[PDB]
Amino acid sequence: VAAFLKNVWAKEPVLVASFAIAGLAVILPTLSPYTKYSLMINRATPYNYPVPLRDDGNMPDVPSHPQDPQGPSLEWLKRL
Amino acid sequence: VKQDMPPVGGYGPIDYKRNLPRRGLSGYSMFAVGIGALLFGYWSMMRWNRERRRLQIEDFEARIALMPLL
Secondary structure (H helix, E strand, C coil): CHHHHHHHHHHCHHHHHHHHHHHHHHHCCCCCCCHHHHHHHHHCCCCCCCCCCCCCCCCCCCCCCCCCCCCCCCHHHHHC | CCCCCCCCCCCCCCCCCCCCCCCCCCHHHHHHHHHHHHHHHHHHHHHHHHHHHHHHHHHHHHHHHHCCCC
16 A cells, blocks of 8 residues: 555645644544543533522531532543 | 957856755655644643633632622
8 A cells, every 4th residue: 555655645735644644633632631630620610500409408508608628620631 | 450359368157057055954854844833833832722721710719708698
C-alpha cells in the first residue's frame, strides 16, 4: 500500500491531507483522556438557579450553606 | 578610414541562458514550521479558553447571588 500512497501523494496531495486530517479528527477524541474534563466543565456551568430543597430532617449530602465543606466543589477546574 | 567596428579583442560576454536560482526551503522544513505554529496556537487557545470558562462561571455565580432581590 506504500506504492498507492506515494502515487496518490504525488498526484493529488490535497485529498491525502484532507483524509489524514479527517482520520485524526475521527480517531483522536476516543484516545485523549480530556473529554471527561469537557463533560464536567460543561455540566459545572450554572445557567439556572440552584433551587433549594426543603429540610425534611435526613439529608446528609447537601449542605445548609454554600461555604460548608459538603457539596460539589471545582478545585479541579481551578487546578486543571 | 573611420567606421563602426568592434575592437581587436571583441566585446565582453553576453548571456542567453535561462537563470532560475531555485531559492527556498525543502518541503519538510515548511511543513514542520506549519505544524509547530499550529501546536503553539492550539496550546495558547487552550489556556485562554480555560481561563475564559472560569471567568464566565464566576459571572454566572454573581448573577445567581443577585437573582432573589431582582
